[PDB]
Structure 1
Amino acid sequence: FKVRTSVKKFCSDCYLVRRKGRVYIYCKSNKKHKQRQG
């Protein structure tokens, strides 16, 4: 997980999710693309 203020989806296989009052970006292909909005 890259915890950061900015949370953009990198590849096409990335998908944005809204859980626990935080924007997560998970990804099905590349595991490096996992991000979390703060």
Structure 2
Amino acid sequence: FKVRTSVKKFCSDCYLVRRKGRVYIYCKSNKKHKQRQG
């Protein structure tokens, strides 16, 4: 993960999901594009 306050999807494979009171972005291709908000 890359934990940061700005969570923006990089590519079309990235999908935005919201669990446990936090915004995540998981990417089915590039694991590098894994983000968490806070």
TM normalised by structure 1 equals: 0.98
The CA deviation at 1:23 is 0.1
Runs (5+) with no aligned partner, structure 1? none
Tell me how many residue pairs correspond in the alignment: 38
The CA deviation at 1:20 is 0.1
The CA deviation at 1:33 is 0.1
Distance 1:27 1:21 in 2: 19
TM normalised by structure 2 equals: 0.98
Distance 2:27 2:19 in 1: 15
Counting helix residues as a fraction of each chain, which structure ranks higher? 1
Runs (5+) with no aligned partner, structure 2? none
RMSD: 0.3
Segments of 4+ in structure 1 off by > 6 A?
Answer: none
